[model samples]
Target chain A: SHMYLRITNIVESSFFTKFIIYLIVLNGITMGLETSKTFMQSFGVYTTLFNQIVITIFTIEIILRIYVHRISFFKDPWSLFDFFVVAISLVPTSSGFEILRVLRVLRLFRLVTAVPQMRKIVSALISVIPGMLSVIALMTLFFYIFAIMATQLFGERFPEWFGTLGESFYTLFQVMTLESWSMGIVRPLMEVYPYAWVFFIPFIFVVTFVMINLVVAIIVDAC
Target chain B: SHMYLRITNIVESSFFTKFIIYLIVLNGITMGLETSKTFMQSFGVYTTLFNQIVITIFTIEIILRIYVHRISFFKDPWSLFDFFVVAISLVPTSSGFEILRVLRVLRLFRLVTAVPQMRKIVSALISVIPGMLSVIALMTLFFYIFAIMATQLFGERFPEWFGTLGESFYTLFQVMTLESWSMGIVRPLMEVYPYAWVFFIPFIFVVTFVMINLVVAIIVDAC
Candidate 1:
């Protein structure tokens, strides 16, 4: 208990927090360098060596955090997040299967855990998930309803857009995102069924307005 | 004042309101039909004739509103919006230069003015513009800074993307939209400038965060 208490002091120290923050940034830079062919070709060994060293250090820091905090450490979600991130990187994988190495980029997210401001923003974002689930369900319901209707109505004419339920859903998803909605999709459809706007304009309004209200609901909750 | 008071009673009557609502809907149908080649080819004269009648009715309704409300009608922004929409459609133009005819769609917005529910939603939307302006300015400033940097850093190598300030701004805008950002753009750029993510990632983070915060601010204010 005495040694654990001492470890907690060092772990909670300002310098220790800054050190972890700096290490996460260094890890992030190396991960980024791994994305580049030239850098990996040049100093690949140093990059790999430094990454292993950083991972070992990160593993030690989490171990100390777990020792100091003990049962309470498991209670803190952020601490568990840190544990998982470190654990994921340590997983053994063949060179041909580098999913673990690619996922090392997730360790960069520990920056969120290290920084107070980012933690609060993420918390606020997470806090609104419950509120958003209902709205999301409503949106999904509409998507399904409209997707079915679109398939039935336009399927025969425009097979590419509304050929099947899944295709209709995908196309509606794109429409909801407002990416090339009018000119790219609807205008072409409109050339055939001139009154097609009657169907789509309302869908756009309801979906968009619902999304706006969802944003309002989230912001209101956040406030 | 007594005569004007009676005019207000008739204008504000439930029947009159319903009549104007129906008139707006009729106007919307004609405007939509104008976009249909087949409809315009077959019943073009009737469409034009019905549109003229609806416009005359709309004009009278606005005149009544002006007469009854007097100077206060001008003070109301929505009333001015209606006045301007009507005025624009009434403008004389050659068939070859029928901007006025196309501008008739602005009348459909009167549906918002006519309905109390839509009016409140629109009022909420308009209320947030002032708050958004500052954030918008900040975003624009960041775009300018990043665009100038991109032009300088990658212009010589990637003329298609960062050749000029305008191209940089456009490419960055596309990046901000997350449209094929990584696989399409940054990945290709990464093959050349290994450290390019160092620049682009921060720009993405700042711009996206600012936009999310902007949505939050608007929603918060609406609440």
Candidate 2:
């Protein structure tokens, strides 16, 4: 009992947690520096050695956590999340493929669980997703309807833009964002159809209005 | 007294109001059609005649409205707006430049005042503007600080994006839109600085969160 209590006290102490945060931040900085040709040219070996040391310490930290928490460690989502993040690097280093190495950056997300303030923001963001489903559904429906109509109306003349449902949807999406919609697509279409604005203007208005409301939905829910 | 009553009855009737709305819609469609080269080649003379007639009718309608409302016509904002839209076309047609002729499209905005349903939406939109001023002010402040910092930090290396305050502001605006922020700017910058995300990631998160709140401010105010 004394041994378990000592290990738990050391792992869960305020200073220990703060120390781990510092390591995480330092590790992130070094990982980023590894991306630089100039920084790597001079300090590449040292940087790689430092990362291995940090990652090994992280593994030991996770092992100590499992030892202290035992069966309950698997039950805690955040604990399991921590275990998974630590486990990822182990698997990649054991293998040869470098593809999954970039995924190590995701360890940065551990800060959400570690920081109380950020946890609340993450929870609120998660809660807002369900309410946004209906809005997204309606958006999809509107996009489909407009895409079909655009394909039928302009498909013959503007084959590249409205030739297919997919192309029309993509083009309409560009228009909805007001990204060169005028000079890019609508004006070109208007050159041929003249009444093109009659179709495109309402589509733009409705789509953009809905997008603004989507942001409203998130903010109101979070508030 | 009889003469005054006669003009009031004619102008204030529901049928007369509906007729004016019809004319407005018809005029908009005809003007749109006039932009088509083939349509103009065939019906240019008739289209010109029809537009002149409609403009004459609009002039007479405004004159009658002024007679009926007297000084009150100047007090009502919508009435003044309607008068201004009609007067713009009158001003340009007497002159040489064909430039301002396209402003006739503004007559379509009359629907906002004419339709009671739309008037409420327009009013809500206008009311939201005052509350948005502070949010916009804070946004401008944040942008200026970030722009200056970005210019200082990256200006020497990435001159095109951060060479001047104005260019920095414009580039930041593009980044704010998430258009190609990652691949276009951030990734390119990261190729050099490696730790550019340390600067840009927080900037993006804060800027976008503020933008979301702006929409929230409108929605909450309206609700």
Candidate 3:
């Protein structure tokens, strides 16, 4: 019991905590650098080496955490998060699992663990699941109906943008964000269908300002 | 005093309140219709008529409110909001105030005066100003720095998108929103620079996820 308590104390120490925090930040930077073709061409060897180093440190950190908490470590969700984070990276890339490469970016999310405010925020978001689900259901329903309409309406001229339900869904989401909805998507459509604004503007008003606004407000309130 | 009380009672009456709420929705629909080529061609004269109609009703509502509250009407911020909204619409559009066209949607905000939940959402947003200001400043700083980099780095090749500081700022804001940033902007840059990911991805990580995630979290907490 004495050694176990001491291990917990050491693992929770500020020095160790700061190291893990620093590691998360450094890992993000190195992972970003790994994406640079120029950097790889010049300093390719260091990319894999830096990744292994970060993963090794994370593995060591998790081992210490498990040792300190022992069986109770599995009970703490954050500790389990730490365990899974380290364990997933253990999959051998050489084993022909190219899909595992994208999972590596989950490392960036460690900042949420390193930061307490973010953890509280995550918990708050989780608490609002019911309210959000209602809004999400309505949002999805609207998207589905509108996507079908858009596919039929604009499918001929803008085949790439709204040729299918899936593409329409993507384009409608663009419209809802109010990002280039006018000049980018709808203005062109309005040229072909002069009454298109009748349909599109109302959708933007109802979705962007009314429904999405409420969804965000609900989440903000839930927080 | 008796007559004044009756007017105050009437203004606060459910009938008057419902009329104002209904007016906001219909006005929004008509406004959307005015933006369309076909609708404007078919019903162009009604645009001017609808404009005067809304302004008159808003004017009448506020005048009645002022008569009821007297000098105290100006004291209540919501009453002032109602007054100014109608008063601003009184400004002659012929006076070369093209900016007023953009502010035409100010009519939509009348929903708050008609609805209480929206008022609370506004209060919730206002209360988080202190927390948001810090994130806002940090976000601006990130954008300014990145805009300069983007302008210089991609300005030559992607002149329209990142040619100048203003263009870069706009493009970066699009990226920050995660709206087609990959396909619309960054992927284009990546095709040339190859190493641009090192510059952009980390920026998105810090500004989009970490910084913005916290800003909304703070607002949600304030809520």
Candidate 4:
């Protein structure tokens, strides 16, 4: 009972958040290391040991948080966020739990919980979604129209790139990012049909330049 | 007075804007159709005739706008926008400005002037840049820092992906887009360092997700 006060002090300290951030980074490193075939072959034992230690740290952090915050612990979403990430990691490793291991890496998102600036930005992202809903539909509709058109036009010519509506949609989304859209995709298409730029250019103008700005404007207005 | 009033009525009329909008679309369609080898083979004469007529219309429209607006025509940016598109197109196609044919395509930006909503959005984009100046520098600074670190860490083993600071920046910028980062860059690196995820996942979160949101927030706040 008396230890609870000190535990509260530790949990509420600014240094604690910084410490948790370090552990999250450490846990992330080990998880990445575990994926390396050579690294695992050589440092397999150390990686496992490191992961267990990080997991224990996460588990204890959650406990101290719960103890300090008491019933109010569950009230804060960030605390709940931490609990969920740690909870999934500590899930019983029984018959059906192997799939949960994949989710263990989501523990890295613990940084989002610990970092306040990140939370402000994330909450803004969340708040903007409702405003973006119609815009999202508009974007998807444009994607659908373009995807269908691309599938029909380039599907036969560039089967690997635009073989299906799904493929075309993905490629179009990539185009929206302005990443090698001209040099990579449209230019390649232009080799076969120089006229293809007509479709690709206007499609880019409407979706990438126009729609993207509108989305930004809407979110800015909402904010 | 009679001449000035007639031009003013034409320019101020809603139908003028609608008619101008129609011509822009028609001009764009003809430009597009001209690119198609098959279509142009059969309809080449018509496409050429149509482009000549559109150029005449743009010339006459600008003259009429100048006649009505007179000296004030140069004052309004949109008027100058209209004039510029017309002026650049009027640059003789027969001479050294033959290179400017490609620049002729930028005439499509006339839609921004013809359409009010587009200009509003475009100017909004322009207005936001001033607000983003410092924040952009912040992002580039972090990019430089991370690029240097990534070059040192993964540069040794993964020369293609992280050969130098510049390549690392490019790769990291690619990662920011949430594209093939996992399967393409980070996953392959993990095979070598395993602990690469520690550097990567957080690096991505901080740069891509957090920094992007920060930019958005600054823009929104500026609004």
Alpha-carbon local distance difference test for all models: 0.78, 0.76, 0.74, 0.75
Ranking by lDDT: 1, 2, 4, 3
Interface RMSD after interface superposition, each candidate? 8.7, 8.9, 8.3, 7.5
Q: Against the true structure, what is every candidate's RMSD?
A: 15.9, 17.5, 14.5, 16.3
lDDT of 1 at A131: 61
TM-score winner, 3 or 4:
3
**Where does candidate 2 chain A have its weakest 10-residue lDDT segment?**
A214-223
On residues A1-223, what C-alpha lDDT tens digit does candidate 1 reach at each position?
A: 6887799899988889999999977776565555444676998989888988998999999998888788999999999999999998898646654445555666777877887756765675556557668887998899999999999989899986788896687567657756567876789999898998998999999999997786666666655
True contacts kept of each: 0.15, 0.11, 0.15, 0.09
Whichever of 1 and 3 has more lDDT, that candidate is 1
Tens-digit lDDT track for model 2 on A10-68?
99889878978888888888888999999999999999888888889888889898888
Per-model TM-score, in order, reads 0.52, 0.51, 0.51, 0.49
Off by over 4 Å in 4: A1-174, A177-223, B1-16, B86-103, B123-127, B148-166, B190-198, B215-223
Give the DockQ (2 decimals) of all models: 0.07, 0.06, 0.08, 0.06
* Candidate 4, A1-223: lDDT as tens digits: 5787777788888899889899888878788889999998999999887888888988887888778777898899888888888888887656585778788788899888888889999997798677555446545645655665676578778987887667877898878876777546865787796567676766765675455565667656544
**Per-residue CA lDDT of candidate 3, range B34-101, in tens?**
89999899998898698789888888997898887789988887778877777677777767767675
Please report the candidate that would top TM-score against the real structure. 1
Candidate 4 has an lDDT of 0.75
| Candidate 2 segments whose C-alpha is farther than 4 A from its true place | A1-173, A178-223, B1-5, B93-99, B148-167, B190-196, B216-223
